[PDB]
Each structure stands twice: as C-alpha cells, then as structure tokens.
C-alpha cells in the first residue's frame, strides 16, 4: 500500500509538455557551433522571454522534464503553466557548454523532445539532419524578416496530421509571435502524444 501510494503521488495532476528551443547565428552550419552558443540576439532573447517567466531550478517544485537540481543542466529556464497545462522549455542558450561532456549531456537532453523551435538567422535555409535526434516529429522554424516581421515554416513527419493554428509559410508580426508559437507547440505535442 505504501509503494502504491508513493507511485500514485508520483504521477502528475496536470498536462505536461516538453519543448526544445535552439538558436542559430550567421555562418553556423555544424552541430558543434550550434550547440555551443551561450547567448543570442536581442530579438531572440525577447522572443524567449515571451514564452514564460524564469524559474530557479535549485528551488523549483514544479515540473522538471529531465533537468537536474545540481545546476549542471543550467540555472534558469523559462516556465509557462496554467490551471491545467504546464510547459517547460529546454532553451539551448541557458545550458553551459564549456566541456565535451557538457555537450553530450545537452545533446542527449535536447534530443529526447518531440517539438523543436529552431530559431534561425542564418543566410541559408535550415536543413534537416544538422542536429541528429531520434525524435523531432515537428520542427517549427523562424526566419526573421525586415520591418520586425517574421516568417514561420513547419516541417513534420508524414504520419502527424494537421495540428497547429499556424499554417506552413505563415507570416506574423512580432507581437503575435510568442502566443502563436506557444499554442502551436502545445497543439503539436498533443498531436504527437495522440499518435
């Protein structure tokens, strides 16, 4: 009875989602430099800041999604939760990457997620296979444009049906970008889970 009660208490009581966020700078087309970034552009930081408030991992009692208390996986991470839906982002610009084992840990943490928000300011189109991962059925890609506009391209596996409120090739302004991206990621996670 004690073991079963502990197991029941272990299970969550809301909807939990796990999302990976990357970042690409100009002239980066390899795994090593794409995973070694420690900071991003002002627009990228503002966009990530709009996906939820920051939580200190040392004293956070909510959902973890594979993160660790020791601070090896990072000290801060964006957090957005509601009365029934809780989402935590594995931002790649917050996890230190000062050593090879750190790179391996970051890759094995980000590669287990089913949704990737691949921000990209690169002068060339993003190519599948730059960051190897077994998962990744949905890969939302954002290309910044002029006049603060943004471009959104979605690549999905054939099995995944139509899921999001953001169609492929949608163009949105800066104000709508965080809310629409978050809702699309939540819907994509729901579709992948239902698959």
């Amino acid at each position: 009875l004690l073991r079963e009660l502990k197991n029941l208490d272990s299970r969550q009581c809301r909807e939990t989602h796990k999302i990976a966020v990357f970042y690409i700078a100009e002239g980066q087309e390899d795994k090593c430099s794409i995973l070694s970034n420690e900071r991003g552009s002002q627009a990228y930081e503002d966009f990530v800041a709009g996906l939820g408030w920051e939580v200190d991992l040392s004293t956070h009692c909510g959902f973890m999604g594979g993160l660790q208390r020791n601070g090896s996986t990072g000290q801060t991470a964006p957090y957005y939760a509601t009365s029934t839906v809780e989402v935590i982002f594995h931002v790649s610009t917050r996890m230190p990457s000062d050593s090879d084992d750190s790179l391996t840990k970051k890759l094995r943490h980000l590669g287990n997620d089913e949704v990737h928000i691949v921000w990209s300011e690169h002068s060339r189109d993003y190519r599948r296979g730059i960051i190897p991962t077994a998962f990744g059925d949905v890969s939302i890609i954002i290309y910044p444009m002029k006049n603060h506009m943004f471009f959104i391209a979605i690549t999905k596996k054939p099995e995944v049906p139509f899921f999001g409120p953001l169609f492929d090739g949608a163009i949105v302004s800066g104000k709508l970008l965080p809310s629409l991206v978050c809702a699309t990621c939540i819907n994509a996670s729901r579709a992948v889970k239902c698959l």
């Binding site: 991003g40 920051e54 801060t76």
Partner: protein
C-alpha cells in the same frame, strides 16, 4: 513568500561569424578570352524590351522607385521604434498571474 521570477539574462548582439566576399561564377582568367558570336546568344536586358512595352516599362520603373522610397521610410520608422523600446517588452513579457 511571493513568487518573484528570476531576471532575464542580458543578450549580446555580436554573436556568430560575418563574411563579406566577392562571388564570381567563373575565374578571372576566363574574362581575358575575347568573346565570339556564340557568346551573344543570350540577349542583354537592354535589348529585351520592345516598342510595345516602353510606356509600361517606364510606369513600372516609376512605381518601383516610389515603392523603394516608401520602404526606406518604413524601415527608418521601424528601426526608430525598435530602438525606442526596452529589452523587457511589456506588451509581450509573460508574467505569473497575481
């Protein structure tokens, strides 16, 4: 106590390599070779316009110039607005509910 979110990290704009080179479809040694009558098969854009499209060409040129001026003005106002705003943008900063 109250839930106070952690401050955001400060971003640096100068991240990533920058390249400014010159692209040439063929090496400069090719340019030394004199042209022959076969190299003129592809017509130049100057000769591609006919007498029946001159007024249309001029109208499109004037319209494109006007659009370029308009887009330059919009770029100026957009960059001014962007530099006016602060990093913690209130209109899109997610915060915990009270």
């Amino acid at each position: 106590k109250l839930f106070v979110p952690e401050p955001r990290p400060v971003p640096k704009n100068d991240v990533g390599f920058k390249y400014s080179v010159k692209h040439r479809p063929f090496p400069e040694e090719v340019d030394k070779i004199p042209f022959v009558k076969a190299d003129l098969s592809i017509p130049d854009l100057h000769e591609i316009v006919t007498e029946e499209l001159e007024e249309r060409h001029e109208k499109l040129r004037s319209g494109m110039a006007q659009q370029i001026a308009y887009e330059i003005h919009l770029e100026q106002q957009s960059e001014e607005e962007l530099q006016k705003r602060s990093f913690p943008d209130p209109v899109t900063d997610c915060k915990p509910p009270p």
